[PDB]
Amino acid sequence: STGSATTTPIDSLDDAYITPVQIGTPAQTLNLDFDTGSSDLWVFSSETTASEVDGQTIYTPSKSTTAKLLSGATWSISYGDGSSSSGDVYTDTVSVGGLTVTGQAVESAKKVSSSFTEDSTIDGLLGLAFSTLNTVSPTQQKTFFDNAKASLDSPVFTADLGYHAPGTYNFGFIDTTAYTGSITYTAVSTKQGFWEWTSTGYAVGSGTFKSTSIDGIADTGTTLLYLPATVVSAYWAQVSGAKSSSSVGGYVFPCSATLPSFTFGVGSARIVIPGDYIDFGPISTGSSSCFGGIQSSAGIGINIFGDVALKAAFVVFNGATTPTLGFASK
Ligand SMILES: NC1=NCc2ccccc21
């Protein structure tokens, strides 16, 4: 089998991407944040604290003839931005772009933190990291991809995120029309539960390439590109007026600036992030100070190849016995 779904930025800044997901019988379609940085499928639901729902579409298990309460199971998760959610668990039929999994763990939110409440466009998350990170207790549950894998034509999924435009998530095949040149594959460590790999270096604008190993994770659920402070300092030093701001929380730059591109290495191959991808707009409405899309990972404890980097590429999440990651230009 295969599936193919369109993913859409939630706002004009590409702050995140939502993909329609069908849950239950009859289908309830919710717009979920496909997150290769986490491993829980959780949704706003009829069980969510009334006051914490503000425009989201909810999953109502009582309306689904195929939903079953997973007895005694609970979940609780905290993400890297300090956000969190928790609740109970159902199993139900879940379909993504024509690909169907029966008996998928659908984690129903009883509580969500304010950032979720405040974002009416995201109805929940669909995790695509390794199931070893899944938070369900006392019986850990598998991800949609893990459950579908044996059924797929090939045990892969691909992420093709757009810059201020829709993109695609494919399951089970590689669309050879969706990228240019060849796909370069690179080793993955699953030891922390992530799609963790090692970039071979970087360049700033028309700068010479710096060969240096940068370990980090391919994370579609993170908006920005988080890299070592040395790398980030080298980038922003090429932008007149750019500065690290403690008050704002990162590098800012004049909104009048033209940003240089940023290149990262995949083996001997190179992926170029155009400068405009690194502009995340005024720090506050009306400000002429803009927030940077490349930020230091110092204090995060891990480098993150978030959407700013991934949207520059066609990315293969290869779920074979020994997983690997592939990158192509597009
Ligand atoms: N993977 C993720 N990075 C940041 C974040 C916030 C909320 C949910 C998922 C993520």
Side-chain angles (χ1 to χ4, degrees), residues 160 178-184 264 269-272 311-315 326-330:
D160 177 11
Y179 58 90
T180 62
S182 77
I183 303 170
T184 297
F264 64 92
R270 305 287 173 256
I271 302 288
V272 181
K311 73 170 83 165
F314 174 91
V315 190
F327 293 80
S329 295
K330 68 196 191 184

PDB file of all heavy atoms in Angstrom, residues 160 178-184 264 269-272 311-315 326-330:
ATOM      1  N   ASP A 160       8.104  16.528   2.061  1.00  0.00           N
ATOM      2  CA  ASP A 160       8.362  17.536   1.035  1.00  0.00           C
ATOM      3  C   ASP A 160       7.608  18.792   1.425  1.00  0.00           C
ATOM      4  O   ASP A 160       6.510  19.029   0.931  1.00  0.00           O
ATOM      5  CB  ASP A 160       7.940  16.944  -0.310  1.00  0.00           C
ATOM      6  CG  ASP A 160       8.075  17.883  -1.488  1.00  0.00           C
ATOM      7  OD1 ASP A 160       8.701  18.967  -1.334  1.00  0.00           O
ATOM      8  OD2 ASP A 160       7.534  17.544  -2.572  1.00  0.00           O
ATOM      9  N   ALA A 178       9.547  14.459  -7.669  1.00  0.00           N
ATOM     10  CA  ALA A 178       9.457  15.498  -6.642  1.00  0.00           C
ATOM     11  C   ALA A 178      10.771  16.134  -6.220  1.00  0.00           C
ATOM     12  O   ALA A 178      10.841  16.996  -5.329  1.00  0.00           O
ATOM     13  CB  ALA A 178       8.795  14.880  -5.403  1.00  0.00           C
ATOM     14  N   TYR A 179      11.865  15.726  -6.848  1.00  0.00           N
ATOM     15  CA  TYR A 179      13.185  16.215  -6.510  1.00  0.00           C
ATOM     16  C   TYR A 179      14.059  16.242  -7.760  1.00  0.00           C
ATOM     17  O   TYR A 179      13.731  15.628  -8.783  1.00  0.00           O
ATOM     18  CB  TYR A 179      13.869  15.381  -5.417  1.00  0.00           C
ATOM     19  CG  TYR A 179      14.031  13.912  -5.779  1.00  0.00           C
ATOM     20  CD1 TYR A 179      15.157  13.444  -6.423  1.00  0.00           C
ATOM     21  CD2 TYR A 179      13.042  12.995  -5.457  1.00  0.00           C
ATOM     22  CE1 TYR A 179      15.293  12.106  -6.749  1.00  0.00           C
ATOM     23  CE2 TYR A 179      13.160  11.657  -5.767  1.00  0.00           C
ATOM     24  CZ  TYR A 179      14.293  11.218  -6.421  1.00  0.00           C
ATOM     25  OH  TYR A 179      14.432   9.886  -6.744  1.00  0.00           O
ATOM     26  N   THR A 180      15.165  16.955  -7.603  1.00  0.00           N
ATOM     27  CA  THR A 180      16.121  17.095  -8.683  1.00  0.00           C
ATOM     28  C   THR A 180      17.370  16.289  -8.322  1.00  0.00           C
ATOM     29  O   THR A 180      17.603  16.026  -7.138  1.00  0.00           O
ATOM     30  CB  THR A 180      16.523  18.554  -8.975  1.00  0.00           C
ATOM     31  OG1 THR A 180      17.156  19.135  -7.822  1.00  0.00           O
ATOM     32  CG2 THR A 180      15.290  19.411  -9.261  1.00  0.00           C
ATOM     33  N   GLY A 181      18.150  15.907  -9.340  1.00  0.00           N
ATOM     34  CA  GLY A 181      19.385  15.172  -9.077  1.00  0.00           C
ATOM     35  C   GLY A 181      19.074  13.860  -8.367  1.00  0.00           C
ATOM     36  O   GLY A 181      18.037  13.250  -8.602  1.00  0.00           O
ATOM     37  N   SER A 182      19.984  13.436  -7.500  1.00  0.00           N
ATOM     38  CA  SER A 182      19.837  12.184  -6.769  1.00  0.00           C
ATOM     39  C   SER A 182      19.635  12.411  -5.278  1.00  0.00           C
ATOM     40  O   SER A 182      19.878  13.480  -4.700  1.00  0.00           O
ATOM     41  CB  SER A 182      21.054  11.279  -7.022  1.00  0.00           C
ATOM     42  OG  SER A 182      22.138  11.741  -6.243  1.00  0.00           O
ATOM     43  N   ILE A 183      19.153  11.353  -4.636  1.00  0.00           N
ATOM     44  CA  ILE A 183      18.955  11.384  -3.196  1.00  0.00           C
ATOM     45  C   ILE A 183      20.216  10.842  -2.535  1.00  0.00           C
ATOM     46  O   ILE A 183      20.629   9.721  -2.818  1.00  0.00           O
ATOM     47  CB  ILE A 183      17.734  10.563  -2.753  1.00  0.00           C
ATOM     48  CG1 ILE A 183      16.427  11.002  -3.430  1.00  0.00           C
ATOM     49  CG2 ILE A 183      17.575  10.570  -1.237  1.00  0.00           C
ATOM     50  CD1 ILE A 183      15.278  10.034  -3.171  1.00  0.00           C
ATOM     51  N   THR A 184      20.819  11.631  -1.654  1.00  0.00           N
ATOM     52  CA  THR A 184      21.953  11.186  -0.877  1.00  0.00           C
ATOM     53  C   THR A 184      21.494  10.688   0.502  1.00  0.00           C
ATOM     54  O   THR A 184      20.886  11.437   1.258  1.00  0.00           O
ATOM     55  CB  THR A 184      22.994  12.290  -0.639  1.00  0.00           C
ATOM     56  OG1 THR A 184      23.551  12.707  -1.887  1.00  0.00           O
ATOM     57  CG2 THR A 184      24.143  11.721   0.176  1.00  0.00           C
ATOM     58  N   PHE A 264      23.917  23.306   4.025  1.00  0.00           N
ATOM     59  CA  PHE A 264      24.355  22.227   4.909  1.00  0.00           C
ATOM     60  C   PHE A 264      24.686  20.977   4.088  1.00  0.00           C
ATOM     61  O   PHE A 264      24.138  20.686   3.029  1.00  0.00           O
ATOM     62  CB  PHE A 264      23.346  21.884   5.998  1.00  0.00           C
ATOM     63  CG  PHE A 264      21.996  21.337   5.597  1.00  0.00           C
ATOM     64  CD1 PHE A 264      21.762  19.982   5.486  1.00  0.00           C
ATOM     65  CD2 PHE A 264      20.927  22.190   5.345  1.00  0.00           C
ATOM     66  CE1 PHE A 264      20.519  19.484   5.150  1.00  0.00           C
ATOM     67  CE2 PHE A 264      19.702  21.703   4.984  1.00  0.00           C
ATOM     68  CZ  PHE A 264      19.480  20.349   4.870  1.00  0.00           C
ATOM     69  N   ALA A 269      27.043  15.751  -0.612  1.00  0.00           N
ATOM     70  CA  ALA A 269      26.018  16.571  -1.255  1.00  0.00           C
ATOM     71  C   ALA A 269      25.748  17.817  -0.402  1.00  0.00           C
ATOM     72  O   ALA A 269      26.180  17.899   0.739  1.00  0.00           O
ATOM     73  CB  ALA A 269      24.741  15.789  -1.479  1.00  0.00           C
ATOM     74  N   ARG A 270      25.014  18.733  -0.997  1.00  0.00           N
ATOM     75  CA  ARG A 270      24.814  20.033  -0.374  1.00  0.00           C
ATOM     76  C   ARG A 270      23.368  20.453  -0.564  1.00  0.00           C
ATOM     77  O   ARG A 270      22.882  20.373  -1.702  1.00  0.00           O
ATOM     78  CB  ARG A 270      25.717  21.073  -1.011  1.00  0.00           C
ATOM     79  CG  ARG A 270      27.199  20.782  -1.045  1.00  0.00           C
ATOM     80  CD  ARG A 270      27.863  20.898   0.311  1.00  0.00           C
ATOM     81  NE  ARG A 270      29.259  20.467   0.326  1.00  0.00           N
ATOM     82  CZ  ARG A 270      29.729  19.324   0.807  1.00  0.00           C
ATOM     83  NH1 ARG A 270      28.992  18.375   1.350  1.00  0.00           N
ATOM     84  NH2 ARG A 270      31.044  19.078   0.748  1.00  0.00           N
ATOM     85  N   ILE A 271      22.765  20.881   0.520  1.00  0.00           N
ATOM     86  CA  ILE A 271      21.415  21.465   0.467  1.00  0.00           C
ATOM     87  C   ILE A 271      21.463  22.946   0.803  1.00  0.00           C
ATOM     88  O   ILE A 271      22.011  23.328   1.841  1.00  0.00           O
ATOM     89  CB  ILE A 271      20.478  20.715   1.429  1.00  0.00           C
ATOM     90  CG1 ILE A 271      20.392  19.219   1.122  1.00  0.00           C
ATOM     91  CG2 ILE A 271      19.110  21.362   1.466  1.00  0.00           C
ATOM     92  CD1 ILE A 271      19.628  18.880  -0.140  1.00  0.00           C
ATOM     93  N   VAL A 272      20.900  23.759  -0.083  1.00  0.00           N
ATOM     94  CA  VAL A 272      20.925  25.200   0.029  1.00  0.00           C
ATOM     95  C   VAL A 272      19.563  25.716   0.482  1.00  0.00           C
ATOM     96  O   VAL A 272      18.538  25.557  -0.173  1.00  0.00           O
ATOM     97  CB  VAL A 272      21.319  25.847  -1.320  1.00  0.00           C
ATOM     98  CG1 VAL A 272      21.337  27.352  -1.112  1.00  0.00           C
ATOM     99  CG2 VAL A 272      22.652  25.332  -1.861  1.00  0.00           C
ATOM    100  N   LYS A 311      12.497  22.076   4.615  1.00  0.00           N
ATOM    101  CA  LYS A 311      11.686  22.525   3.486  1.00  0.00           C
ATOM    102  C   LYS A 311      12.512  22.836   2.235  1.00  0.00           C
ATOM    103  O   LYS A 311      11.978  22.988   1.137  1.00  0.00           O
ATOM    104  CB  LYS A 311      10.839  23.707   3.976  1.00  0.00           C
ATOM    105  CG  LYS A 311      11.573  25.006   4.189  1.00  0.00           C
ATOM    106  CD  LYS A 311      10.637  26.171   4.438  1.00  0.00           C
ATOM    107  CE  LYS A 311      10.111  26.403   5.820  1.00  0.00           C
ATOM    108  NZ  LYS A 311       9.517  27.785   5.914  1.00  0.00           N
ATOM    109  N   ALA A 312      13.830  22.943   2.399  1.00  0.00           N
ATOM    110  CA  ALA A 312      14.779  23.113   1.318  1.00  0.00           C
ATOM    111  C   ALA A 312      15.095  21.795   0.605  1.00  0.00           C
ATOM    112  O   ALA A 312      15.824  21.827  -0.398  1.00  0.00           O
ATOM    113  CB  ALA A 312      16.061  23.772   1.825  1.00  0.00           C
ATOM    114  N   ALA A 313      14.548  20.703   1.132  1.00  0.00           N
ATOM    115  CA  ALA A 313      14.910  19.390   0.623  1.00  0.00           C
ATOM    116  C   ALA A 313      13.696  18.505   0.455  1.00  0.00           C
ATOM    117  O   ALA A 313      12.663  18.739   1.063  1.00  0.00           O
ATOM    118  CB  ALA A 313      15.901  18.704   1.560  1.00  0.00           C
ATOM    119  N   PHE A 314      13.899  17.472  -0.348  1.00  0.00           N
ATOM    120  CA  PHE A 314      13.017  16.305  -0.386  1.00  0.00           C
ATOM    121  C   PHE A 314      13.681  15.306   0.559  1.00  0.00           C
ATOM    122  O   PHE A 314      14.855  14.974   0.328  1.00  0.00           O
ATOM    123  CB  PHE A 314      12.859  15.791  -1.802  1.00  0.00           C
ATOM    124  CG  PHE A 314      12.070  14.504  -1.942  1.00  0.00           C
ATOM    125  CD1 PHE A 314      10.702  14.528  -2.149  1.00  0.00           C
ATOM    126  CD2 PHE A 314      12.733  13.281  -1.864  1.00  0.00           C
ATOM    127  CE1 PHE A 314      10.005  13.343  -2.290  1.00  0.00           C
ATOM    128  CE2 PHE A 314      12.039  12.095  -2.004  1.00  0.00           C
ATOM    129  CZ  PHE A 314      10.685  12.153  -2.213  1.00  0.00           C
ATOM    130  N   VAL A 315      12.977  14.896   1.601  1.00  0.00           N
ATOM    131  CA  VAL A 315      13.581  14.109   2.667  1.00  0.00           C
ATOM    132  C   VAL A 315      12.903  12.749   2.784  1.00  0.00           C
ATOM    133  O   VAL A 315      11.679  12.645   2.913  1.00  0.00           O
ATOM    134  CB  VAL A 315      13.550  14.827   4.028  1.00  0.00           C
ATOM    135  CG1 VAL A 315      14.383  14.108   5.080  1.00  0.00           C
ATOM    136  CG2 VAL A 315      14.048  16.265   3.885  1.00  0.00           C
ATOM    137  N   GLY A 326      17.486  10.186   3.741  1.00  0.00           N
ATOM    138  CA  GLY A 326      17.912  10.634   2.433  1.00  0.00           C
ATOM    139  C   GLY A 326      17.501  12.085   2.204  1.00  0.00           C
ATOM    140  O   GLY A 326      16.420  12.451   2.645  1.00  0.00           O
ATOM    141  N   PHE A 327      18.368  12.831   1.554  1.00  0.00           N
ATOM    142  CA  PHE A 327      18.113  14.203   1.181  1.00  0.00           C
ATOM    143  C   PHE A 327      18.410  14.450  -0.298  1.00  0.00           C
ATOM    144  O   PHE A 327      19.446  14.032  -0.810  1.00  0.00           O
ATOM    145  CB  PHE A 327      18.976  15.199   1.949  1.00  0.00           C
ATOM    146  CG  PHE A 327      18.725  15.345   3.432  1.00  0.00           C
ATOM    147  CD1 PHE A 327      19.252  14.429   4.324  1.00  0.00           C
ATOM    148  CD2 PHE A 327      17.975  16.413   3.902  1.00  0.00           C
ATOM    149  CE1 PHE A 327      19.022  14.593   5.678  1.00  0.00           C
ATOM    150  CE2 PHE A 327      17.743  16.560   5.249  1.00  0.00           C
ATOM    151  CZ  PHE A 327      18.268  15.646   6.139  1.00  0.00           C
ATOM    152  N   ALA A 328      17.506  15.154  -0.961  1.00  0.00           N
ATOM    153  CA  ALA A 328      17.722  15.622  -2.324  1.00  0.00           C
ATOM    154  C   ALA A 328      17.305  17.085  -2.406  1.00  0.00           C
ATOM    155  O   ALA A 328      16.441  17.556  -1.671  1.00  0.00           O
ATOM    156  CB  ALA A 328      16.921  14.827  -3.341  1.00  0.00           C
ATOM    157  N   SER A 329      17.916  17.811  -3.316  1.00  0.00           N
ATOM    158  CA  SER A 329      17.472  19.136  -3.677  1.00  0.00           C
ATOM    159  C   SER A 329      16.187  19.013  -4.483  1.00  0.00           C
ATOM    160  O   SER A 329      15.819  17.940  -4.971  1.00  0.00           O
ATOM    161  CB  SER A 329      18.575  19.820  -4.465  1.00  0.00           C
ATOM    162  OG  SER A 329      19.732  20.029  -3.671  1.00  0.00           O
ATOM    163  N   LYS A 330      15.476  20.116  -4.636  1.00  0.00           N
ATOM    164  CA  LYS A 330      14.203  20.121  -5.328  1.00  0.00           C
ATOM    165  C   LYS A 330      13.889  21.507  -5.893  1.00  0.00           C
ATOM    166  O   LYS A 330      14.717  22.421  -5.877  1.00  0.00           O
ATOM    167  CB  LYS A 330      13.074  19.650  -4.396  1.00  0.00           C
ATOM    168  CG  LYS A 330      12.743  20.585  -3.252  1.00  0.00           C
ATOM    169  CD  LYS A 330      11.912  19.966  -2.136  1.00  0.00           C
ATOM    170  CE  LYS A 330      11.396  21.028  -1.181  1.00  0.00           C
ATOM    171  NZ  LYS A 330      10.660  20.444  -0.029  1.00  0.00           N
TER     172      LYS A 330
END
